[PDB]
Design a protein around this nucleic acid. Sequence first.
RNA 1: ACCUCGAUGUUGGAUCAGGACAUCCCGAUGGUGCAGCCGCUAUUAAAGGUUCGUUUGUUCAACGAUUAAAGUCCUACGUGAU
RNA 2: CCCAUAGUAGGCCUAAAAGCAGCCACCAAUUAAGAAAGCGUUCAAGCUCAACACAAAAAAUCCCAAACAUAUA
Lengths: 82, 38, 175, 222, 43, 316, 101, 162, 167
Amino acid sequence: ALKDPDVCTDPVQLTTYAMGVNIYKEGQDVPLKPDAEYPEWLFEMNLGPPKTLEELDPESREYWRRLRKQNIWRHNRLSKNK
Amino acid sequence: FKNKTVLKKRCKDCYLVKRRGRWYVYCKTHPRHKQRQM
Amino acid sequence: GVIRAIVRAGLAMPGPPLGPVLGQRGVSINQFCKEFNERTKDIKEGIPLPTKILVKPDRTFEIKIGQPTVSYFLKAAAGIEKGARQTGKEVAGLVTLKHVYEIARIKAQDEAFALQDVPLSSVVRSIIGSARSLGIRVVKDLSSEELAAFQKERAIFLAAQKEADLAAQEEAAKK
Amino acid sequence: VKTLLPVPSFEDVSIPEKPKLRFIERAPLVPKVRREPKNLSDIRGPSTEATEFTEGNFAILALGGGYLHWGHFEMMRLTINRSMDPKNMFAIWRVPAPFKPITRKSVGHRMGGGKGAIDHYVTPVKAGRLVVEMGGRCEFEEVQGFLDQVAHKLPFAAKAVSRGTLEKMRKDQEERERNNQNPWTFERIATANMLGIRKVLSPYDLTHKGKYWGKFYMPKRV
Amino acid sequence: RGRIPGRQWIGKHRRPRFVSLRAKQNMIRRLEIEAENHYWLSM
Amino acid sequence: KRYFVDYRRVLVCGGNGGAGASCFHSEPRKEFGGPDGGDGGNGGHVILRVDQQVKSLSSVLSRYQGFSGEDGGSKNCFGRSGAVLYIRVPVGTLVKEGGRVVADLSCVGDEYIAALGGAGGKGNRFFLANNNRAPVTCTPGQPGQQRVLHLELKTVAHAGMVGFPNAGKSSLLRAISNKPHVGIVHYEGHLQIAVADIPGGLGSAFLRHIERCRFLLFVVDLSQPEPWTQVDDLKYELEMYEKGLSARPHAIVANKIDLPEAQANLSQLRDHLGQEVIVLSALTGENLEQLLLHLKVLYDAYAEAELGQGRQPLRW
Amino acid sequence: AAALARLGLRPVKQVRVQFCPFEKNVESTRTFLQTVSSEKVRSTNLNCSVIADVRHDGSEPCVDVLFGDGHRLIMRGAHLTALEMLTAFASHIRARDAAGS
Amino acid sequence: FREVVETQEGKTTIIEGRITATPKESPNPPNPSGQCPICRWNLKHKYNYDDVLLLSQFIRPHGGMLPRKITGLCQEEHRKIEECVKMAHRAGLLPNHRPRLPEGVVPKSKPQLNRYLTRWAPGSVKPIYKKGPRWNRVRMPVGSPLLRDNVCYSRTPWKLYH
Amino acid sequence: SKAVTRHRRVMHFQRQKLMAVTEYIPPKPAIHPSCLPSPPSPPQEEIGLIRLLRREIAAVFQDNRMIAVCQNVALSAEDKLLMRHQLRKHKILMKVFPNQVLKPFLEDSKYQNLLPLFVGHNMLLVSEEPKVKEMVRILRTVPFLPLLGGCIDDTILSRQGFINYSK
RNA sequence: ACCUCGAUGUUGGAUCAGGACAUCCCGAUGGUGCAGCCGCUAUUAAAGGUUCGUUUGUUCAACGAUUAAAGUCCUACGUGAU
RNA sequence: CCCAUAGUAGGCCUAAAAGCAGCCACCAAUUAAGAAAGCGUUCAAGCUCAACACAAAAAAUCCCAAACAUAUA
Ligand SMILES: Nc1nc2c(ncn2[C@@H]2O[C@H](COP(=O)(O)OP(=O)(O)O)[C@@H](O)[C@H]2O)c(=O)[nH]1
Ligand code: FES
Ligand SMILES: [K+]
Ligand SMILES: [Mg+2]
Ligand SMILES: [Mg+2]
Ligand SMILES: [Mg+2]
Ligand SMILES: [Mg+2]
Ligand SMILES: [Mg+2]
Ligand SMILES: [Mg+2]
Ligand SMILES: [Mg+2]
Ligand SMILES: [Mg+2]
Ligand SMILES: [Zn+2]
């Protein structure tokens, strides 16, 4: 019975306006802003697969987050058989 | 009490104890986990 | 106790799934449905709204409403109705980084992000990996010239799933 | 701060198309019409084949002689396939299918009457031979749990090992011979016929050097 | 109690025999004498 | 976690008969005694015996294994038959294999076979004859029957307590007695009438189990904003499963009146006045004797209906 | 933490812990306050409060426990370990609860 | 050492920790290069259960064994001393380290049986009804296996089973 | 019997004597290695996380001038995050660093007298602007949260010094 | 196929039994899908007890009525110069 | 030993199956936490962990030498 709200299928409308941003019925669709208005940190993020352990700088928190996560993966596999 | 040649704890509450010459497994949470060394 | 669940906006039902859950705690089911619908009237009906329920010892409840799930924001922005069956071997949707910034600007106002007081840079970074689960691929620059081809080919692939899905049902009937 | 160390990645490891062990039949396709002598010397002494790893890294090392019949294969095959991960593990057979015929007479058999009819087939195994070899995207601790369970049900004394453990085991025995403070060894006395000891020894004892007695292998003998 | 089936020192189930301390010393003493015999036969 | 005993799936394994010895006898003089293997003993049977003492099917064992008959020995020694196994079941228990109604139990003392024990294999001496001087064949013991039993006991519920949860059905059950829960009401004249409720729509599984009742009691909370709406939904769900269950006599009961004292909601039920309703508080035990006296009279009509059915009216 | 939560601060009325952080003999006293101020222990008895007053008077650390019956328990943590203080404190919890009931 | 005393005045309980005199190690150890106090004094393999002077320095006033990390002993000698302490109480050589008896308890009169070199607790030993054959005799343990390497001045080694 | 038997066949007495005499004898050192002074352990290279914390810790003492040392009590995560949200409103950070990393930094540094404070679970309340008055009222919500002390403008102050500075 | 072929026929019963405990009953004690009665299972316990009949040469078994129970065995498959 | 809040009931498929019916991918807020290694739920809830900090034995007349860890082989 319960279903997700119907979403419009129009390439022109999707590019011009973001449908999911507006949630109020009496509200209006929020138009997307041009590239220059958005900040610099938005268009330099890792869109693809995560960087491997070797590619990260050792003197960084994200490098040790990856190593700590892999240790948790190693510990879980050992405990699986036990 | 179930006699076992090898005594294995069946949960985190089981604890080994040396009494009367043979090891015993006591578990107050699960009374069926009690074992006696054979 | 505290119970958290996702409830469709303005479509709360006295029956399952939250019905039996409230019955155990003793919370009045009809009062919850009335309060939720009267509070979610402004929001469009059917929107998945994660709800947090606070239960008092005297069977008194005070509903709490948070921001909609990121999946609704991502799917609506790309026009996709349903997520992909497989991830990485196929592309379900296609959104821009501008879509993520417009989505994160409101999703970061929820209770969880507000209490942490983290910058929007970390909020956008958490949505990029969320779209990966749904199969949506994010491109820095996108135009309607290349979006219309991908969406046209997506429907072709979706029709292929319909052929496979109907084939499985027909085989099940023969069993 | 808890110490953090890099862990090996098995991404380069590849898995065959049939990780599970192939089914083992009771008897070979071609029956043996002619019966064979018992030849108990085929399980006596060290193994001269299948003593090194081929594809995997972990294997069940046999520390004694014995015969494997169809029942033994089923226990190993069912246990390993169920308890292992097909995605990241694979196993192969390091022993052939049952081929040596075993003749058993009907109940009530008195002495005589010639050789009995063929009853079942077995696979003789010598000490130091690898029975089942495993490998893939898995550590030694992951597989040691059920491999010792499989090795425990073998008719002979066995123990799961790896490339490093087996190498360390061999190096330890070599170390024991070098630093042994006993001036008298089995090899020296047996070869030189000291005290006329060869009257109570066997011709195989010149090569076994006291480490093998019947089908039993003694790792503590230097 | 303590019956050994059949005869003591023959058969499948024989009475176990153990090496005493002086038994080891006697064999070692024999070995030393013969080890010296190997030396005088080498020249 | 204590519950009233209801349909429970039990496993019965009959005894397997023993095989023959298949041996030959020898004596110093004759030196050819002939066959002397004795027949194997027959396996025990599993019998469901009705007992009036056990009102409830409390004795529910995980599995039932009959004693296998001993195999025959030398000198024509017949094997001992396996000891029979008896299971205690209340009167009126329905035993089925999940596909059909196998049998029904009439009264105390009735015994029904649910697992045949295996027969005993004949020894080699059974085949001895003038033409067959030295038979050697033996008969293997037939294995005993092992089947899955779907023991279904008609719950003894002269009254059925139905309603949406949090209304107080279990609390009321505790008061009068002082996943189905069953209690007993003891009244004057040594008359005992039982009442059942299932604390958790309500589901088809609940309706089928509550179908095995004689009277239905509807419980509606006084704090409910629309007590009449709750009445219709429970009735409609029951009516959807079966219109006949609605024809059964009912009694609308308002609960939780002690603390709320919602007299406005009380007048609403009286305004509708579909039938004579009863207003009581389970927590404080107010006006319980009023309904309990009426409930006993209601079952009296069912005893007359039991005469038309011909089945015993459950000891009362 | 877990050991004291199983017992509960049912008869406890108020807990006051004072220490001088700059001194080098308040390690157990601070760790004792760590266990008492835990959510599991405090959730058992909401009425009971925990008081922590930091002073720079160079005085010895002491722990004051106020019970409903009116008796007081004073533990000087300068020369007592956290386990010793917890064991002594938890022992009085069982004694006072039995006397009250 | 450290002592704890509780004094109650005016229904108020006060717990205090007072430091007492602490004994000091004797100066000029014979072997300063040792790691644990045993070999620092060349006492390795040179003490027995009857040397209560050595054992009293590693026990509590109630006869309990002291922790290894406090006394500083090695794992090997701590177990050897632990077994010698157990055999010392059983032999009656430590009358001043008896267990603390709670108030209102009077021990019953029990058979005073002299014993020594008792490996196991007396209450946990079953009698040997069937000795068995000569080649499979059930021997009675005497002493402790952990003292197998002690300096023996006799040609016959210690007999640990009778 | 056969040369190879399923059971352990009993050896001839002469062979059994030969086996007993020719048994492995491990070498026995004159002095047990454990009793002799062990050689110094090989140097342990510092973990990149540890050298990352030192750079981050040194920035805290240099960038922000007000540092408040408190005991991170075992508060519930909901209540511990809520106070951090209150501190973030007044631009007050709640940084936590291990003692085994922070102590060596303060051993040879200007803030050498803050060493005895860091014993156990500790947390640092830091801000570029010393909003002591706004911070104190946040901490007064929980009477069981102790304010150990701090150092404002390179001057070490106790809890009472913050109270006087706040007023 | 080792002992007995220069006087034990074997089976069963009667008589009287000694012994093992791997306990059928009585006793003590854990677990239980042990509410209570009944049960199941395990540890401990051999001091005491362990029926009478029909057909059958019977041992055994079938069923007849009982009993707290109608134990498994060994003893020259106990005992036949009783 | 202590501890555990969060982008979320990750999507697919499923009456709903949420870290734990199955499966595709396994990123990520935060000092520090598995798109979950086990239990418990029709499904949820609840729980732990990973994270920060601090090696046996029993048969039938009645067990079976007596015993003894310490004086130089
Ligand atoms: N005040 C009041 N409370 C009641 C009464 N009956 C039940 N309750 C409440 O209902 C709770 C139990 O509900 P329950 O029996 O499980 O409802 P059911 O699921 O419909 O059977 C208890 O906590 C009681 O406080 C009543 O007559 N008066
Ligand atoms: S380290 Fe030398 S005896 Fe303890
Ligand atoms: K004669
Ligand atoms: Mg003999
Ligand atoms: Mg209920
Ligand atoms: Mg031969
Ligand atoms: Mg017994
Ligand atoms: Mg006879
Ligand atoms: Mg006779
Ligand atoms: Mg006679
Ligand atoms: Mg942990
Ligand atoms: Zn347990």
